Design a protein around this nucleic acid. Sequence first.
DNA 1: TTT
Length: 601
Amino acid sequence: MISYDNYVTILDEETLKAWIAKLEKAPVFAFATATDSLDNISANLVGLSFAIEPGVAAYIPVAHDYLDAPDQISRERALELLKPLLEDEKALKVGQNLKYDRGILANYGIELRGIAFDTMLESYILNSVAGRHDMDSLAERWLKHKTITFEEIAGKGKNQLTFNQIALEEAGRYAAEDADVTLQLHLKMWPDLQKHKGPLNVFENIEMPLVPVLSRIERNGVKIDPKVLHNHSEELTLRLAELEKKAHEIAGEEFNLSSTKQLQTILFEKQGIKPLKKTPSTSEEVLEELALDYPLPKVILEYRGLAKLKSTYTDKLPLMINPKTGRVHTSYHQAVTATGRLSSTDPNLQNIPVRNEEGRRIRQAFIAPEDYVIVSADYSQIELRIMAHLSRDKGLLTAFAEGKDIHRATAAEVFGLPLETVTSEQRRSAKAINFGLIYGMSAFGLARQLNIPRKEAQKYMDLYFERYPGVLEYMERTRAQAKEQGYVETLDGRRLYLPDIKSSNGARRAAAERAAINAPMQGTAADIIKRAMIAVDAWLQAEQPRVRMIMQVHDELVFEVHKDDVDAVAKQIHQLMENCTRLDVPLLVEVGSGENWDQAH
DNA sequence: TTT
Ligand SMILES: [Zn+2]
């Protein structure tokens, strides 16, 4: 166990300056801020920890204020002495999720530079699916060392202490150990990270630079109108009441809108085919099947849809408004997805209905501040463009090249008719095929998504591959090397290890092969999106225009732009995104603006 | 992910 003998507690300036001096000449050093809250914008710095060498670490408490806390260097004094080191881009720091720490220092007007290594990201890039990338997991997996957990020194549940309440020495064991271990983790992973140029390229030029940019995005937050959401909520309550009646009115008596219990004894008991509908879900939905004619399942279907939306966004969002900023600050997770795409939580921006009227009403709540407008810059069907590239298909590429709708272009080729005549059903069919390929779906699954018989769908796929051969090759070639080397790469070098690529298991291995085909396109989209964020943020930081990047969701970047700078800014954002990222994939950036996110979306 |  870690005792009080392992690390020093710095309580005097002289000792701090001595450490600063050593830190200044160290090649790299681990750094971490201790605070009184997870909420970055409102958190107060409570202490700082540093590790200069394995086994050599210190904790500097500055704002522990429990009853009779011993004297500590003051926060302002510690920070003024540390500021130079922290803002020196030449002083390289190592840390665990430095995005957090960068933000905390930003509450004090300090701009952390030299953000060179993040062990969370080192781990993530080495093998995204190896397991969780939190430090407790990393310490165990890479060093067979069990770190003191936050719950171990602070407690659990509502009665969990905030770090400033923890005794100086106990706080030190926890924080200094974290610093020491972070440096050790770095010393083990960094050498590994260079066994391959692809992962190294992604780590160095994409993930690390993105660290401060995500901090800025999160800290900027988004402006949401609580009234709009509340009115939406009141309304949904009403509609839910109306819908519950129309359900009672279509049938007899009352009942819960829970199928396989009350519904099955209604819907089919009043004729229909016995199978219900799993809310398994996005492949088998008999409720909406019947919905095309049977009125009850259609209302049950919408009832649930609004119920989920209301309790997830309409009633939640307003409560996420931060009292200190009056804005909402989503949590971006940079090391969680298997493919490399950023994920978002509280709120989860990506689960807000795109093609739905209610989803749009939610986005109407994301408003621009006075004299500003919301600007949306989206990469039009980037993953389809990436496949065209990865497939080297002159046909798909040409379609994009002449600005034609690729779904109608594809239909014209598969069904063999003039582009102008392609019907909605045919476009819908080519669309299902195209997106089916990205997820590497089978002819049978496609049949289930287009409601056509098996082999009929296979008939369509054979025609597709015949008209677009380069796609089948890519797929065969990608499933191939996947088994050859156990992983697939993105254009930049990002890797997705596929352990079950030879699982001798049924589904599990089928899943691995699908991931093999998809990852390279979805992963390349992610690298492209991150590189865009980095390029735009660099311009923002350098030119200092009147714009804030406020969100990243799916394939779009969202901003607040001063109403009088819109055109010059829209132009610049547009050029940076489709011309200052990768030059090999045919990219198209759609830019829109409006008073709210829906207007610009 | 961080405190
Ligand atoms: Zn352009």
